[PDB]
Design a protein around this ligand. Structure first.
Ligand SMILES: CCC(=O)N(CCCCCNC(=N)N)C1CCN(CCc2ccccc2)CC1
Lengths: 53, 232, 284, 217, 336
């Protein structure tokens, strides 16, 4: 029954994680989406001049 | 891989003779094959071509109709059948491998070539520097001047650079004007635009001196250059 | 001439129904199923041939209504040639489908070899070629002759008229009625005889009901072909062998027989496509 | 326009026709999924037909090429790769008749057959059912009554009656009795009649598939 | 055997620790920005050479070539710009559930029910595609393969473990055994120092390729996880599942940001990918069509309905110029 010790040690190692507040991570994702939205040929359809398909 | 030659020898003009190129070491049925000849006093010149599966055959105008190129895929052998030879056909016939797909490197391997002797809309390129002497370590530039815009619509400038060591079959150095061949040292480099091309060699050394040829592949018939010669 | 107006109305309604049914079948085939199997290829070809055949019908209707051909020599030639061509393509496509189903049911291990979509396309093109083999001599022979007051389209050029016209009639009778009837009857009879023994179609109420439905559909197809193609050929032969004075009854009978002949073209989409179980599932 | 891409398109067309030829050659084949319970008679029927995740068995009988996929060697969830086998011509299910009093095991085979006979993917894939070990059934019925496995069995303890009862119990498990067949055969070890039965069932399934394709069915 | 109580205690502690950080949902933060609006995508190219159902695909890093694996025993490599086929590799076993196209373009990988990750060598002399190596050692069907480089590869089999291989030697260098169900997907972070595996135990994990330890575990699903894909930032990912629910997790907050679901959607998800900027979230369904979710507003932005069967695979190029969706219909469209 070593899986019990394996699981509890893995959970203990996973518990000591420095969490980042949800607002900060959400703001970081939003900032990344806004900053790189210009180089997103799927969001804003580029004209057929530089559309290889 | 390996490409061998068979069918040379002195020939009475107006006769006929067959050249055989038997390939051993690669999937012969997937490669298109070319025949390229080199006159004793001249440079390389295109002769004929077969696609993969014999679905397309082309000839140069100087040998069109008189010659006949064919391949035997099960036997892995390529045949050139020449009828009504003339004194201008004395040359040494190379047997060139070529595979065409996106990112391929056509004209990469050249056979050893046979030395048949006979007794007795074409994109033209020029290489002004017919010869130049240099020393090892010097950076040397070789320039090729086309006569038609080689830059196709899809952005691929079709121009190839070959090197012919003294008494050896030529080898591919650069394909499509910028990409190095497999095994070529990274000191070679190619650049330029349509109708203006350049081959740059840095830290040149021995065993790299020969005749540098400049070919297009935009449209048949394929045309080589006169060939800049390096020497020490 | 109320009977003439009735004949014109019958021709027009037959043409309209045939065009509508055929075009709807081609629509369903080209959008939903998309010709992924041999049977859909054959059904599409049959519907196309029947639509082309029934597009010829109102030209003949207006010809009869006016009593003359106003459309000129080129239009006369093309109309007659596509009429004969579409008749032959429809007949040969029916025969090809019958043979295809016979091979599918009686020789399944070899129907694995044969019944591929590429072979279906090859057989289709070949059948169009064999149909051209008689559609071309109409280009080579048809001409809009002129009478004292009438203008008619005929199919006789060579001096041996008695030989040539009779040869054309015998050829169409033999390679459009006798041979097709024999081939489809033999193929479907053998297929049903084999299907009487399949385990999936025997041993329960619903399985035997399915077999009974299949044999009913096959018998309906064969009977419709016979009923829609026998009167016109019989009438052509009788007229070719009898003086048959040109009274109202002869004209009414001939036009009724022609309408019956085009009824096959109007009913084939319903029998072969709208009762195709794949089409039923796509429609339900 | 297509300067060097002409030869690329030619190579594309050549390998396309090679793909089409290989696809036709593969469509000539007929595939048969193989299933069963633990230590069943599946290896036996594999040995009858002479021919490490799954083991594929190729054999030919009367100008017909069969491929047989033994999958019981995968110890993973069956619900995730069972859609790979949709379109298999038939299913060859092996049930041991000698395992009605071992551990229950007959009930395990029955529940497996129920679980993969009403499957959403195999809703029309006809099942060919084998019943190996008839001799052990003969040996054990004379001493072990069938009421051990089926407590409600009210009948004689003869081999024929018990075998018919088991076959009927197995064939009762297909809910859609009007959609897929369940061919049954008691595996005999003589004259290679088992491969003949498989050939007949596969021919019937091919005929049914041809009928469905033609639209008659 | 009381340590089960301790495991429950640490589970409750983790729940409370990641519950305290929940300041505000991402939807609350994102409601103030303008939506992306309806997005029209049309089939620019359709690649029709497969005769059976397609279970995988992968773009090259040049964003022009793509490899597609189907059950007909073929591994075709397409030139998407001109629809030409570059190679057609005949596979050892026609039961293939994944494929991977190496970042350098030299190699391709392919695996399936045979429990073997057989990698193929494209750019070689002799002009033919030759099997470079056959990586054996998994005891269950492979579900996904991804190349770290030409040297290493990470697989995820149905034996509830992921492994990291050394291609030249052929032997596993690291094994990841933390899952309790079949590992049906796998996705490498852009820096390829850590990856995520979605299992059938309704829980993704965050692995470390250097050590071999599961850093974090992300629960929250109600059924098997069929697909997974890192956010382009490399600090988040989104998982598809059989319960018609795609949800975006976050490595730094160690929670789930939102969920992408709709009452009209009851069909599970077979594939998930992100647009180049990460604003969009493509997701294939069993309902034969794809949905362009807005990754920040949870709203839809379009539908990619051009397939006649389940879209088993889906992939966005590295330059974001196209979306390739291959389905069991045996056609592999390319949208834009
Ligand atoms: C022996 C049969 C016969 O003589 N004809 C075919 C009968 C038409 C039925 C077609 N059914 C189908 N394709 N499914 C001929 C009848 C007469 N027409 C005359 C063509 C014509 C005549 C005058 C003006 C324009 C066209 C030819 C076929």
């Amino acid at each position: 029954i070593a899986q019990a010790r394996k699981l509890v040690e893995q959970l203990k190692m996973e518990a000591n994680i420095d969490r980042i507040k949800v607002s900060k991570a959400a703001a970081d994702l939003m900032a990344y989406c806004e900053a790189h939205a210009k180089e997103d040929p799927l969001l804003t359809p580029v004209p057929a001049s530089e559309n290889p398909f | 891989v390996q490409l061998v030659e068979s069918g040379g020898g002195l020939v009475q003009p107006g006769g006929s003779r067959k050249l055989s190129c038997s390939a051993s070491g690669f999937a012969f049925s997937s490669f298109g094959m070319h025949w390229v000849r080199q006159a004793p006093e001249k440079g390389l010149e295109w002769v004929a071509y077969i696609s993969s599966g014999s679905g397309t055959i082309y000839y140069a105008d100087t040998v069109k109709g008189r010659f006949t190129i064919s391949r035997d895929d099960p036997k892995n052998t390529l045949f050139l059948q020449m009828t009504s030879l003339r004194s201008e056909d004395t040359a040494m016939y190379y047997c060139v491998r070529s595979i065409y797909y996106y990112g391929s490197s056509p004209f990469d391997f050249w056979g050893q070539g046979t030395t048949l002797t006979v007794s007795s809309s074409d994109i033209v390129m020029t290489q002004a520097t017919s010869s130049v002497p240099v020393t090892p370590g010097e950076s040397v530039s070789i320039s090729c001047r086309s006569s038609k815009s080689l830059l196709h619509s899809n952005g691929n400038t079709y121009l190839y650079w070959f090197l012919q060591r003294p008494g050896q079959s030529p080898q591919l150095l650069i394909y499509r004007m910028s990409n190095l061949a497999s095994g070529v040292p990274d000191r070679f480099s190619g650049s330029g635009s349509g109708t203006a091309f350049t081959l740059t060699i840095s830290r040149l050394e021995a065993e790299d001196v020969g005749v540098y040829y400049c070919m297009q592949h935009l449209e048949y018939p394929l045309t080589f250059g006169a060939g800049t010669k390096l020497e020490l | 001439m109320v009977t003439a107006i009735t004949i014109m109305a019958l021709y027009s309604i037959v043409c309209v129904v045939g065009l509508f049914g055929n075009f709807l079948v081609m629509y369903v085939i080209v959008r939903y199923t998309k010709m992924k199997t041999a049977t859909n290829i054959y059904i599409f070809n049959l519907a196309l041939a029947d639509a082309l055949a029934t597009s010829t019908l109102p030209f003949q209707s207006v010809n009869y209504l006016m009593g003359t051909w106003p459309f000129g020599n080129i239009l006369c030639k093309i109309v007659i040639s596509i009429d004969y061509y579409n008749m032959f393509t429809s007949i040969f496509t029916l025969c090809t489908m019958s043979v295809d189903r016979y091979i599918a049911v009686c020789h399944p291990v070899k129907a694995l070899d044969f019944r591929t979509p590429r072979n279906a396309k090859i057989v289709n093109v070949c059948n169009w070629i064999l149909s051209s083999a008689i559609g071309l001599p109409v280009m080579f022979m048809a001409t809009t002759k002129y009478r004292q007051g009438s203008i008619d389209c005929t199919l006789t050029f060579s001096h041996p008229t008695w030989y040539w016209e009779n040869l054309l009639k015998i050829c169409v009778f033999i390679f459009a009625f006798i041979m097709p009837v024999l081939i489809i009857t033999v193929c479907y009879g053998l297929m049903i005889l084999r299907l009487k023994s399949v385990r999936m179609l025997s041993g329960s109420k619903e399985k035997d009901r399915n077999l009974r439905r299949i044999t009913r559909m096959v018998l309906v197809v064969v009977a419709v072909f016979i009923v829609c193609w026998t009167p016109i050929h019989i009438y052509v032969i009788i007229k070719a062998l009898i003086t048959i004075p040109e009274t109202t009854f002869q004209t009414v009978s001939w036009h009724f027989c022609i309408a019956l002949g085009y009824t096959n073209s109007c009913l084939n989409p319903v029998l072969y496509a709208f009762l195709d179980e794949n089409f039923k599932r796509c429609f339900r | 326009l297509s300067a060097e891409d002409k030869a690329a398109v030619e190579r594309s067309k050549m390998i396309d026709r090679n793909l089409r030829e290989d696809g036709e050659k593969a469509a000539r084949e007929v595939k048969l999924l193989l299933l069963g319970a633990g230590e069943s008679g599946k290896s036996t029927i594999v040995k009858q037909m002479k021919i490490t995740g799954i083991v594929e068995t190729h054999f030919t009988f009367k100008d017909l090429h069969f491929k047989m996929f033994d999958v019981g060697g995968q110890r993973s969830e069956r619900k995730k790769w069972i859609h790979c086998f949709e379109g298999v011509t038939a299913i060859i299910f092996c049930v041991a008749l000698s395992d009605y009093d071992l551990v229950n095991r007959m009930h395990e085979s029955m529940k497996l057959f129920d679980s993969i006979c009403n499957n959403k993917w195999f809703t029309d894939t006809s099942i060919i059912l084998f019943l190996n070990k008839k001799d052990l059934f003969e040996e054990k019925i004379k001493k072990s009554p069938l009421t051990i496995c089926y407590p409600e069995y009210a009948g004689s303890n003869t081999y024929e009656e018990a075998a018919a009862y088991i076959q009927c119990q197995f064939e009762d498990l297909n809910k859609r009795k009007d959609t897929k067949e369940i061919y049954t055969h008691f595996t005999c070890a003589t004259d290679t009649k088992n491969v003949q039965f498989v050939f007949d069932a596969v021919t019937d399934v091919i005929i049914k598939n041809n009928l469905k394709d033609c639209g008659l069915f | 055997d009381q340590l089960r109580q301790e495991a429950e205690q640490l589970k409750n502690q983790i729940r409370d620790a990641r519950k305290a950080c929940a300041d505000a949902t991402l939807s609350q933060i994102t409601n103030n920005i303008d939506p992306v609006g309806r997005i029209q995508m049309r089939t620019r190219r359709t690649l029709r050479g497969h005769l059976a159902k397609i279970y995988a695909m992968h773009w090259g890093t040049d964003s022009r070539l793509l490899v597609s694996a189907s059950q007909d025993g073929k591994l075709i490599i397409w030139d998407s710009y001109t629809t030409n086929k570059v190679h057609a590799i005949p596979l050892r076993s026609s039961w293939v559930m994944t494929c991977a196209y190496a970042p350098s373009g030299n190699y391709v990988a392919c695996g399936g029910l045979d429990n073997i990750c057989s990698i193929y060598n494209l750019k070689t002399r002799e002009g033919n595609v030759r099997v470079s190596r056959e990586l054996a050692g998994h005891t269950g069907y492979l579900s996904c393969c991804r190349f770290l480089d030409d040297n290493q590869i990470v697989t995820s089999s149905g034996d509830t473990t992921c492994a990291l291989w050394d291609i030249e030697t052929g032997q596993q260098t690291t094994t990841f055994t933390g899952h309790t169900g079949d590992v049906m997907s796998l996705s490498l972070a852009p820096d390829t120092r850590l990856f995520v595996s979605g299992a059938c135990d309704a829980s993704a994990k965050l692995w470390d390729v250097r050590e071999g330890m599961c850093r974090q575990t992300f629960t929250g699903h109600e059924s098997d996880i069929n697909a997974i894909c890192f956010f382009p930032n490399g600090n988040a990912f989104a998982t598809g599942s059989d319960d018609a629910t795609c949800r975006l997790f976050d490595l730094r907050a160690d929670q789930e940001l939102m969920t992408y679901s709709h009452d009209n959607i009851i069909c599970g998800i077979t594939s998930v990918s992100f647009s180049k900027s990460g604003r969009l979230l493509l997701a294939g369904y069993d309902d034969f069509n794809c949905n362009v979710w807005d990754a920040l507003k949870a709203d839809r932005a379009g539908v990619l309905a051009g397939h006649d069967n389940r879209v088993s695979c889906l992939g966005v190029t590295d330059d974001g110029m196209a979306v390739a969706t291959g389905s069991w219909d045996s056609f592999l469209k390319i949208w834009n």
